[PDB]
Amino acid sequence: MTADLKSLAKRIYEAYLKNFNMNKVKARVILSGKASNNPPFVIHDMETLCMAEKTLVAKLVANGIQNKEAEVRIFHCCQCTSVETVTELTEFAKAIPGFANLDLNDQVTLLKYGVYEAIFAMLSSVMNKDGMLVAYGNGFITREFLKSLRKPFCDIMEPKFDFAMKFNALELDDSDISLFVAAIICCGDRPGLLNVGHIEKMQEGIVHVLRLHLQSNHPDDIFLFPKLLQKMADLRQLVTEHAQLVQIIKKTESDAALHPLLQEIYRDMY
């Protein structure tokens, strides 16, 4: 591995830690309970939910949702998390050598289709077999509780849990995930791209640094890179299935509005 590539990776790594407050290392120390005797508040039923919701009683009232069904409240708070992560990814993309120089429309297109593939990828970092950290690591909503919600809301997170478990089995660190997320955004296959040639050249570089980094960082996992390539395909499919379930929810649930920023992303996605 050369020096220009070795720096390009650290640069990507740098932008990852600067723009994402909840990295895998922060989460893994919380979940282990080895650096603090004060665990996060656990949400496992409607009771503990209403207790945690009393913390954000201000924004629930502002958004006129404080009185709606419990499933819809979670669906609304989670949209906020997506908006934040989409924003953070928009800033993270600037550190991708060549992304800032692409035409503006192609930047919107790359993010329009990649953000949710990146979200579900990074979402694995805050997940275990029993639940996921929430509110910057101050809460832990249980997997079973999300399954107990009424359909179709109970079908939202479970596939993400299933993906995170298999994804976490690869035992990647933020060093690897950062490059992995960069490759997800720099995909020359996105419908609507104008300068496909430039983006593809930009992707070949990212994917190259990733393949070398994986060999350097995980030498005893010979086919870790092929495994990831298959993980990109699984994420793409996972997002498709997710977008299908959202359109089913937005139409057959007149009570669960859709955030304006996310409406654009989901609009004419596939």
Q: Which residues line the annotated binding site for indeglitazar? A: 82, 116, 266
CA distance 236 to 208: 20
In the bound state with ligand GW9, the residue whose beta carbon lies nearer, of 146 and 206, is 146
Q: What angle do CA 190, 194, 195 make, to 5 degrees?
A: 100
Give the binding range for ligand GW9 (CB under 6 A) out of 8-16, 52-60, 93-101, 103-111: 52-60
In the bound state with ligand GW9, the residue whose beta carbon lies nearer, of 63 and 215, is 63
Is 160 one of the binding residues for ligand GW9 (CB under 6 A)?
A: no
Q: What angle do CA 249, 105, 250 make, to 5 degrees?
A: 5
Bridge-based pairing state of the strands 131-134 and 127-128: antiparallel
Of 215, 244, 240, the C-alpha closest to 228 is: 215
In the bound state with ligand GW9, the residue whose beta carbon lies nearer, of 8 and 256, is 256
Which listed residue (8, 30, 31, 77) binds ligand GW9 by CB under 6 A? Answer: 77
CA distance 269 to 263: 10
Task: Check residue 124 and report its DSSP letter.
Answer: G
Contact 239, 116 (CB under 8 A): yes
Which listed residue (80, 165, 170, 229) binds ligand GW9 by CB under 6 A? Answer: 80
Is 74 one of the binding residues for ligand GW9 (CB under 6 A)?
A: yes
Which listed residue (42, 52, 72, 170) binds ligand GW9 by CB under 6 A? Answer: 52
Give the binding range for ligand GW9 (CB under 6 A) out of 58-66, 102-110, 170-178, 193-201: 58-66
Which listed residue (24, 76, 211, 231) binds ligand GW9 by CB under 6 A? Answer: 76
Sign of CA dihedral 240, 203, 174, 259: negative
Rounded to the nearest whole angstrom, what is the least distance from the CB of residue 130 to ligand GW9 in the complex? 15
CA distance 30 to 213: 27
Site residues for ligand GW9, window 101-140 (CB under 6 A)? Answer: 123, 134-135, 139
Tokens representing residue 169 in the block: 């089995």
Distances (CA, A) of 225 to 15, 86, 220: 22, 26, 12
Rounded to the nearest whole angstrom, what is the least distance from the CB of residue 239 to ligand GW9 in the complex? 15
Q: Which residues are annotated as a binding site?
A: 82, 116, 266
Site residues for ligand GW9, window 243-262 (CB under 6 A)? Answer: 257, 259
CA distance 103 to 84: 24
Is 147 one of the binding residues for ligand GW9 (CB under 6 A)?
A: no
Q: Which residues bind ligand GW9 (CB under 6 A)?
A: 43, 52, 56, 59-60, 63, 65, 74, 76-81, 123, 134-135, 139, 141, 257, 259
